[model samples]
Target chain A: VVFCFGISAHQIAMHVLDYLSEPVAVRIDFVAQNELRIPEITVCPRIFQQNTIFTDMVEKQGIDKMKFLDLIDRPEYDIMAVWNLSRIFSDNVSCSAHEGSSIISGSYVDPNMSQPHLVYTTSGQCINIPASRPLIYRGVNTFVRITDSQPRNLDEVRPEAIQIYFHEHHHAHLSRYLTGLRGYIVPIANPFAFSIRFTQINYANKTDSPCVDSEEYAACVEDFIEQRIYEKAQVQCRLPYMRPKLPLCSTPTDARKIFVATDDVIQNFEKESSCKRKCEETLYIVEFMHLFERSNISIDMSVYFAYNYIQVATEYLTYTLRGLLSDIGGVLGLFLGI
Target chain B: VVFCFGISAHQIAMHVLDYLSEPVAVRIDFVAQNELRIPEITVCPRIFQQNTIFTDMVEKQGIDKMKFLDLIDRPEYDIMAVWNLSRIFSDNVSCSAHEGSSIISGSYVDPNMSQPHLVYTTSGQCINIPASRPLIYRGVNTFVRITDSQPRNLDEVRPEAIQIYFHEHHHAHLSRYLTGLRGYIVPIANPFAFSIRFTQINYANKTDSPCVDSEEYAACVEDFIEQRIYEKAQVQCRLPYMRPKLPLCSTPTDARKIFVATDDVIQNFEKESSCKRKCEETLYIVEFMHLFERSNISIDMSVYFAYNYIQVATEYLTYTLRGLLSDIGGVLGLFLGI
Candidate 1:
């Protein structure tokens, strides 16, 4: 089986379709414990069968990933291509897959073939990959049992293996990907990092909360979704876009210079680019851009800059005065006998 | 002998020559103690005799009508026409001139042609003229003699007669005239009459003389003299005249009108006349003009008018009210069967 993970299936399908001209037979199954009772489906095609298939599945036994794996392990199946397999099987299935190998272990790759052996390192060290051929395995019948325990056949084995593999491997991968992408990767990779940071900082210090508690979190999430939806709708409908602008200083004179310099970079960007292509891409950005334009951007920025400068200056002054007093005391001690 | 009374014979001669251009022989005598002590001198043309003839006469006695009469009674005298008789005999001389009958017994025309009869009236009545000439008898000489039982002659008579005449006639006339000119004649007359009536009534009711019993009478006399002096000084200096104008209404509005009118009159007078001329003329009018004008009028006329008006109005009201009340009472009695 050739399986893909981490990325969206629909996105991969689109990418594949771009390279191939020939027709391909494709069967898509949502292999979940609750087939008809999937909590949510984000990127499913809209042409899929609805209540007829959903009711049929719920009335009978649902065709879960374990049942599919059991069916695939039968003798009739010769070759399989697991496209976007988001789940892993259990140890039993893993051991069955690695039958008749001294180097293979439960749910792990053949050490010699796959990579350097997995080892615990107290000191922080770089990982290394080894040059080796990938291992191949067959049906569930070809596994050596080490313990004196009666193992179930393919039906039971598949469900147990899937549960264990998901907990130990697939679940860990999902957690790491989500945390990293949300905290650093997506923000760093996106063009909106500056605007995001500006909004985060301003909102964090604001007098009132954008969302009060967990009860309001859902509404906030909906607002976020609505903003994105609006952007998509505008783009699809070919609506005109509006942008905000940066504040400007008119002239350089003693009286005129009494006013603080303009610092509304975000506002200036929105104002200049409101009718451009990029502005129609996201309604969240457009709404935020409008808010920034409406804000007293120059005055707010001046106040924030002044507050920071005063904080730094006070700290510097305190440090400098302490240092000066200490130096004077040291010199006086040197002059006078103790 | 040609002799003057109180004035020197030389002064009389000068006066006579000034008035009369006819040249005549003249004899001058200097009499002392009822005797011609200086020898008589005859004077012709350009023989000026400035004799001190009346000097002893004036010093030993006084310049009065009696002294003039005594000089006239001298056997040498004929017709004498006194000129510029400014110093008419004082009241003392007038009083003493009534003691015995001689030709011109008093200060003026005499009834007893044999001696002198004083012709001035004690009251303000006209002088009595004699129809037939009367004789001075020998038996009446004893009654008019300078005996021990009689009072001192002209000296005592002069002060008493002057005081009596002033109190009886002059004071009353001056008071009424001043009151009339002030246009407050009725009320002013009331106070003056009350003062005079108090004297008379208190004296008639009590046995004591009003003048002796009440010091207020003396004070009133003093005040009268002071007022007269003030009036005289004001007249001589001609101060600005102020007269109360009759009010158009009895309300407070009339008070305001009077104030405005008085101010207007004062302003008009001040503008038309210089201060000196106004003062002099006003003061002279206040002092000399006893009536409102040069018309011989008395304040009693106004008092009589106010009195009659009050009486008529009060009597009419009393009679009308009595008639109305009597009719109302009669009707009530008939209705009540009383």
Candidate 2:
């Protein structure tokens, strides 16, 4: 089984995995920090074609020290667990025997413990080191997780166990093996469950924050990214898709383009009705059905039939739903009937 | 003497006396016939070269019947005493003539009262005839006397028996003679005294007959004759005398010869000043003098002066008194104080 972290990141990861023809399972684990809670782990099947475990806690501690210590000091769940995590983790847990098991690895100790272990690893090797020493690892699955002995609840048990297990054995068992693996790791986390809950509560009570949720700021950020992407893509694509060729109907060189196009029915209506209503609304509907189509399985019999009808109608009759249906029935309808 | 008979015949007789030139006396007598007072006899100077008498009564009667028998039937005056007279008498007076002296000749009566006692010889020829008869005796003095027997308040008498004289008897006497000779003569009783009275009255009254007073009638007759004479003289004299030699100042062909000399001055002034006030007023003054210059004069004086003025002005001045007077005063004044 593979896991994904946050909802948006999980969606992006799934899309990337699908584009690479790999299988992925997305799960979200909320990790506690001083002011943030993020998704802790994400698992993809055969993403690197070797043992590689993407651990949010290990990467956070390795790449972002301040955030990693803050999360380690405040664990929101006492325990987290994962069942049959064979693709992401190896069975060897000792520092010397876990050598040559991971493409990348690292380790961290709980500050509250009196004797902290600093484990180190190399490609196809692992070793446990003292707290006063530094450790480094290289491998596709070189990640650390922390397993709390105290369990908070059943729902927290799966993900927290996987974090604790990875943190304990990452340098000892996976770092040496992962040293020469040519791949990448990404984490899945749920920040909303722990760190963002306080912010959400404060926002609901109408308190101030450093960054207000202003539409103008959001639009300015979106426009900046869009303009950069357009310029970069224009240089790369160089084809008809480069800036969409601006259709001689409207051109950047035309000083009176806005004046002319303002009255042009085709240009204005295409933006208002075609692009906004048809394209954007149909895309939203497709994404909505992909997410919630099978969420309620024990529905009323009539509702079940109605759900089937909606699935068939939306997937088969609507050409835009061909790629969005996950159910076999809907997928079959999309391929054959649509 | 010359006599006028009745009033009507006297007027006719006076008309003939004006044809004479200054006769001496005239007489008038009334004969009672059929209760009508008619003129009886007339005596005056001869009007023609032949000795003759013009009597209104004698002219009406033939000479053979003129009576000398009744003393009252004869004229009280002698015929030879009248200077020049026209007579008007009744036929009764003419028929009382002497039978031996009554001789009718050449359709007029001639009283051939030839008296040898009163004869005067001239050049040894019998040139004297009866002074009582009308005759022209050769070598007879043409002078005669005339007087009035009626005294002034019966207080005055002359030793010459108030004789009025006839003198310078020539063509004028002859004209009186012819005018009177149409009447027959009466027989003479006191020829000398009667002739004096006859001549006195003829000159006084200017009648052709002894029985008429002709002064008033003679004026009109004289005017008529003078007008004819003036017209005849103008016909003969005006062409040469009033002719204009220069074309610039040529006289009109119808110019009057005997026009008043001042009349030409007034006319020329009027012609030149017909359109001017001052010059026309001067011409009006000249014309006023021409009209009323002689209004206060007697008829004889008026006639004589008018004749002399016209003759002297027209003939001597040659019909232009302005040039004539200026020339006479300018040139002849140095020589003759003209």
Candidate 3:
């Protein structure tokens, strides 16, 4: 069984598949991973709503009825699937601007940042969904437009700001996209490891679970179930060095409730990979492979490879100061009597 | 005066110049922006050279002489040009891996992540550089690697987990490549504007001066220096609605000092655009244009525009929720009875 905390765990799951697929001679059938229908997004609708002291929020900045529909509102009146993830992450399911369709950078200066913030990594994808209320667009506030020509309405301005507070607060949506080459660039803002504010309870830890305690939670590094599933597969596959030693599962449970979210695709993946030897390893890889395929999840390996490409040197950079640096280290060491 | 937070910024500055050179009909003159002599990286020497913390960190996961020379190390004997701005950003000024020249992932998982955490945005570019005392890389435990093969590094076999303290933290290097699509996306992480974490103090607030409090600081949503210069230029240009409203200056003191941090290119830009009227607005645009040209600053207006392309419709989305959502709003309105 596998569970994920966020999109990252999902991507990691894909990367593992890529590694499994790395074996050239022994090919694994993974079509089910592609064919199964995958939902565009799963969100927790309640989180989408915010509240104030006296008035309640109609809708938050980026979480308006319009956006939810565009991304996950699901066809007319299907408010059900409209619930699940976090604003901490953009709905990668819908955002493919990085495929390079050339999105325009129309005029915008977030009253805070004087430089026109591009809000993206170089591939041209929006790193975060920049939401605003009135969800301000085109350098013109649409909600304000009706009142725009009405002249000064200072008395109503506060409510307008409040009414659209969630919407206007969409500007806050920009914060989710805060990423850089070295990790959370803005610890000052996004201080949490996961989306507690926008809860996705299906995979969240139960009050009695090991994940509930701070120490144990840290032990999980935010994705407790993912590690467990990987370990089970490792044990099944006979990988000698599997991690976070698990108390061997008392029962070989049917795989469904573990890996994915939505309805049971587990049966398809499970039946597809019938383990010849129920207790043997190696077969676990086959099961793992089936898990993703049954879910229609085709991983985008671009970022994985990108990190590798830039994280290390393809070839060592030439340096003339090599002997010099080491030599200085030695002399300084001797001088300091280390 | 042109100041910077880090290399990405410096490059962003360069990119800005490239755009400016794109002459509308004929195109901007920045073939140099492409073919140029862009240096690899630079850092102030004093920033490196660990204290006894060096010895204490020798036991650091990946921290050792090897990693520093590879990433962040500067010496008196070092080639000086590697210097730029922030410790917050990486030396992306040197990282061109997306150029698709070979760079290797070489199999490493930041042990902190239960799943192999490759902390980065894709595009094969590392959007984050997770560095610590032994700046954990490839999970080698650099400081320990030299002692790794030493017989007693056992107990190492205990978990088969990638060894590195989950909390044995890496003092992350903040990558300076920051952007925003619309407004602050890092409200949870960085409630404040930038210009501080990256510390571009040249034009930072002076205690006794105007930019001293939260209110005035807002007056300078960072790039305080950039705004100061822009405001000065605005005064010279006399455009109405100068943002971050500036006090009218009685004098045009050291125009060169207020502009360039290095040698005098001010003379060239100044003479290049002589105004017929001392206070002509048209001349100010020419001057601002020249400001970018000198430092090879190129503006990527793509985002400023891309934002507009996606930001607003001046109306609503293709789906008219106006009536549909309002029906519910009406019902709720009547139920609550305003």
Candidate 4:
């Protein structure tokens, strides 16, 4: 009896079809920058301009401007003076702005530097203001040099003077101020310098995969992917900058009611939103410390090599023309009882 | 005699293995936002501080401070005056800054709004300064309310006075100053107001494709993809804001030499790099126009609904256990000569 030694014709057809469809194993690989890419190091006052905010409020309230400015001695009203008196690195370090000008006149004076070119490279679309290079490397090969000059008096350490504010309502949400939730609010009264370590997070889509055969198609596809990625990716920093809403303490009996309601609000928010991505790499305020003697305050950052890999699902052709032909010929012969 | 109808054992195993490995077909679908997102509308001075640059130069050259400030009325040297005189939407409309303050004091004065919260939502990582709500909608439902008042005098239209600068060297690259290319340069001698229409370009990676069975894997994958996508994607605006190096018209005898050398330099640089992306969603300087009668100068931005879609290669299991068992049974029976 003639025995069929090969796969059947139907089986061969199915196999060939399956192979043509393309199967991919989602895999991951680690990558590191040849030279470490420094994250954008910005030291912005919590408030864009505290004096501006308070002065405007005075005008709105129809209060006497001169009296409020002079008598109240409200820190916010004197914010401008504080800013003028305060110095960044005390004239020793080389700090430059958008046009390589002094940081004092550039960033210090104009605190509203919330633009693409100043903060982010934005996928090379916007030119970033080049950051100040550190004169000496500390623990990490790169350190964002913050200040070199120590404080002369207690008033000199008042970076927070113009940087923060306490408003009755920081834009209302539910007939209540989302206060801490909505805007940047520093709860601490007198923290001298804040140490921040940025987490390098990244994202991409399947369209960005390398197997795209066409050049024009590749550019279009890649561009589309890039636009979405930026829109979707969040570069959030941690702790003192942002936190859950503080509970109410009006009365013991009503306090329980308020606490539960606020707690529920936070919980409901946590559940409904699927937008937040857990920070795999570090991005947070490390500490809010008092620099007593040395004011060599710096934001420490180092690349966590393990977190720097791209896990892409790449596509490759499993079945070739040679395999198809080989199977087809053998299967056909077996069916024909050759 | 039973005719052997079975596929080979090797073939069956190969088929089963192939079926087990996930296959993905990348497909794209159209999507639209429930509400249109207004892109960050920032009108920044081309030079962060032109006067700062010139004054520094003067001080360095030992040019008399008062003499230089008074003698040559270089617009750049007198940039602060220009900024003080110039305005955003002269007094009629409601334009709020970071904390719902006036736009004049907010953006116009401190034009360095190059930060995450001020510009981009940054994947909800940063709280964007809420753009002013337009009182009336024009062609687009969402309009970034720019201006209501016209330029009273020629000096009022000096928005470009502090906004631009001429520089000897922006910064050195390849031992030569890449003048126009390195910095924000406006070649036009005097243009009234720049009309910019920002194209929304985005990116993402393969790992962001949401077919992962595990939630932890999905978040990590999505976050990883986001971090890289931002790094890779470029959010560039179009010309006359940016252009290729202008040709030289110095002496005709040596002009060709200079032209060719500069041209070759630009060509070589272009060839070496591949970081740029084609903008699908409108990000460009629409025109540098002389606003004749009315100064209702506004940036025109509308969503290209067609371009808003995610093209993802999603993973799905193709060959199931049932199919495997069925094939195995049929092939086994056929081979056994049942």
Candidate 5:
């Protein structure tokens, strides 16, 4: 019968063959934290007024435009008012604080200066805020520490909130006019504030070997970049619609292929690494809840808490060392039931 | 001395235990397509020009406002013009067509109207387009079928392209003024078009049993809805920034808990089903490539292709019937060395 048992041996060992070949499986679970870390907030005006002479230089002169440093050094240009710690917040406290201490008293370190800024005043006086430029300042004007807080019931929330004040019309000296140019149009409203909160998003392969394959490592890093961009762009309010640029990470000359395709350019350029075990990324978000605007008059606003909790979604491969050993024994039991 | 062999026998059978106790593994792959189906396009004006009488009725009246049907029925309120198939496309053809046939010749069926709309004109004459309202029309105005096309090399692209025309200024009788009210502001620019394309995004559990667990099933359906919203709102160009509303999927009375937390209402209401094998979703997108607007005067624009390809990212559990039998054999071999 052509040694049918010998032929059947190969068929019987099919399960063993499949076991020998390894395949990666995935499991997903969300890891939650009781406390979410307080993030940095950046606020700016909807439109800035330029100095008469500064305007003259740009419109009249065939002269090469001054550099950012040169432009800011000059005093004649009508500079944007610096946002002091007292300007944005009158009084703010953390709910989780032991004695309801003021959040302004907490310290923060600025990367540019590499120095800790003790923002609080001895007699509760306003500290002079830093501005990159006089006429047209961009980015965060000042820094204030808001201590970590816990999620609370609605009744418990109102008492321990941070109050934000807007009195732009109170300062009549600042020029206000409706205009449109380039891609952005200044709102007819007097003053609107854009608040950005910075939070960290991290990813790591827990079960599998870390930083093993180049292709896999590249994919993970690219995914992190995309998540970072999505967190930033997806949650903003009252900003002109514009495409988000990619971060300068050295992977390929054509970054568009590496990341999601967009016509925008790159920002926050950084040198790329060969391999990374974890992608620890920080995203600056301006969620709908954080944005505040004043159309006509002065207004006071209070915010309960920064965020509820740190949520982590983890996915791990199912095929582990323990599973492999167990599968080997199963094959033995199936074939020879001795 | 302890009977180490007996203890070792039990330890050796550990692989068998792990194998029998099924753990799901995940593998990721992107399925590509040569041809992408053309999606439905929805276009609208930035702001509706309200009739003098219509404005007066709302402003002066301590009267009950008319419903949508009541308001749209009146023609005296200076109705917004309908978008005929001829108004938008002068002469557009599919790149993958056997012969250069106009896209307007193709047919489409609207959800509202069961009849197939053969959009092409018999004698190259403009046909009357449907409008939902007289004063303030909303949603898709008309339907025109654009045939399926393929991605091509740049040189092979030019001749087989579709041309879109804009001549809003030609209709000089139309009111043109800048204004702002509520959350939306009519842009300073005169004529802008918002084009939405509908594409299918499907998901299913290819390997494992489909729609078994309630929690898992709910999570999957909710994820599909979020993906649908993201595809629509995330890619659009221009037309003020606003929060996206959800679809009426009957799951929880509190739909916010079921989907991503958004303070918006439902649009396309539908009854919920017990279980579904796959989530076959149609997402109407206004991606960067499709949005067209005219600033100064009449312009003719040509597009290469609708979309390059339909990208499908599939994820499947690694634990299968084949793996189960194979792992069993491996476990048996480990224990008996047969």
Candidate 6:
């Protein structure tokens, strides 16, 4: 039989990683000799030691051997979760041999595992912790599993530990999954590519550009500026009509997608409402929803008007600069012209 | 000499309009016989008779034609703004005769003038008042201006009043500007139309659609998705090295340009910065910044491992599915296939 430990914390793994700024990996390795457990005692000085409750249960046999079966020390937090490599595989969740993410998400939050991101290490964590405070303090070994027999090949054990986990700023997985990893995302052959590169049409936004967006934006602003104040900002004042209600819908995420759809918003929503909430509420709602919808974030009519005006004024300013390039016909046309 | 009234109150003009719902245009026109002093008592009965705050300096004549000068109740809220329309025109802000929208700003809460939508009309408003409570009340008319001479065509007076104003759901301009008013936006000629449709370029997005915009947008999404979750996310989570300090140059507005440019906004901004923040705030500025970014969205290793696994797995799936499609291509290709 062989043994391996697993660790997990739904919340603080990233924060702790960020906090320590160190590299101490957690993985399945040759613990009996050529490999080591995650905390490995010497490489990482702080990994935990099992609580005293069952310290005497495990006994060292020779200079370097401990009975693999001796790992079970009461299935509690300090020494529990005794899984079996052979028995655990009894269900063989890997039946999804054709899907990769399942393999990855198996411990990476795959709902199939009951709890995702269960970091399997050579150690066990305290149970019953909330938001996983148990994760911050590593190095306890009350966790385990027993395999029925030794694997035919040693490398199988290492590669079989497939769960990829997270850190403060990174993620990792067993190298076994790297078989030709780089070549994975190749361009897919497209059926609609019928002479895709052979022809050309120009310009994408037939209307959504500064040009079109500008037209409507300008219309909105011009209505306000040239229309209100001492004339430019008048010295005299005239009565202004109330702004109409917003039409039934103009949300960008909404279905219709058309704006300034109608005047009815004002006629019906504003003027005709069942006595709009006396004073404040009525005014506030009108101002908030209708008036403030896109005030500064580019959708404001004034903003559109401003940018468009700049473009227009700039165009009028630059229309004359189009010379030089203007009189020069399609390069070869000039020979025919002469 | 000349007369034009001006008014302002950036905030609530619209709320009141929707509240009442009525008639009133923004510019100047002919009135007396065709234009009589407003509050003309009959047409609009409640037109204020002007408190004697500043009277008579204006003259009176036969009741029907009270000397044009006789209506100045004293010019404060009433006759005062009558100072001079001819003189105000002298500074003419219409330097913008060729431009659109003014360069003024009103309070943010101002009644949103409705109708980035135009929807115009006839009937100019009574000459003047302040913040337009008259705009609020709608019926007062201690308002009127006198004209001395007739234009050669009778439309010159209308053409002379140049500002276009806004209200709930419409735009209004003097009748003069309405020459072919509705037909104002015309088209310009393009020389390349000889066979403009001949040139062609296939799909906008080699991957998606809406070609141009789709391409750039996809480029950005594909970038974040492909880069972060897989590479950085996968490896780091497996064994995060250290958190790197965020590079100094990432402004929330830069790379995000194509978005607002295309009218799309990031769904959630503030909540998505953690993983990246930790890396930078601590260590790994180099290997981390250029190395891993989206290491924790879901599970990095799982994400990459899952994706990579899928590609491999899906290939296995498709490889088998293809043979089926192959022998089936003809069986499927003939009566159903080829």
Following a full C-alpha superposition, what root-mean-square deviation does model 2 have from the true structure?
86.8
DockQ (Cα-based) for each candidate: 0.00, 0.00, 0.01, 0.01, 0.10, 0.01
Q: Which of the CAPRI classes, incorrect, acceptable, medium or high, describes model 6?
A: incorrect
The better candidate by lDDT, 5 or 6, is: 5
Name the top TM-score candidate: 5
- Top-scoring candidate (lDDT): 4
Per-residue lDDT tens digits of candidate 3, residues B152-259? Answer: 322322111110111101211111111111111111111111110010011112222332232333223323333444554433421123535644322222221232
Candidate 3 or 2, higher TM-score: 3
Which lDDT tens digits does candidate 2 get at residues B1-338? 12222432444355444444342111111111111111112232222112233233333432322222112334332222121122211111111111111001101123233222211010001111113533221110111121112223123111111111122121121122222233222222122211111111222221223223223333333333334444433433332322473222113222222322222233222233221111000000000001112222111000000000010000011111122222222222223322
lDDT of each: 0.19, 0.21, 0.19, 0.28, 0.26, 0.17
Model 5 lDDT per residue over A195-303, tens place:
2233334434443345433235434544444444444444222111133543322222122122222211222212333344433333334322222223232211111
In the order shown, the chain A TM-scores of the predictions are: 0.15, 0.15, 0.16, 0.29, 0.30, 0.13
Q: Looking at model 2 chain B, report the run of 10 residues with the lowest lDDT sum.
A: B280-289
Off by over 4 Å in 1: A1-338, B1-86, B91-94, B97-219, B228-338
Error of 3 at B31 (Å): 38
- Per-residue alpha-carbon lDDT of model 2 for A1-338, expressed as tens digits? 12222433444444344343121111112222221111111122211112233234334332321112123434331111111222222222222111113325432222231122332221112222222322222221111222112223223312211211111111221221122111111111221110001111111101112133322332333333334434433332212224466532211212112221221211112122211111000100000001122212110000000011111111112221223322222222222322
- How far residue B287's Cα lies from its native spot in candidate 1, in Å, is 32
TM-score (chain B) of candidate 3: 0.15
| Model 2 per-residue lDDT at B198 | 16
Residue-level lDDT of model 5, residues B120-184, one tens digit each, is 21111111122221111111222232222223311221222121211111111111110000011
Please give the fraction of native interface contacts (Cα pairs under 8 Å between A and B) kept by each candidate. Answer: 0.00, 0.00, 0.00, 0.00, 0.27, 0.00
lDDT of 3 at B329: 30
The numbered model that scores best in DockQ is 5
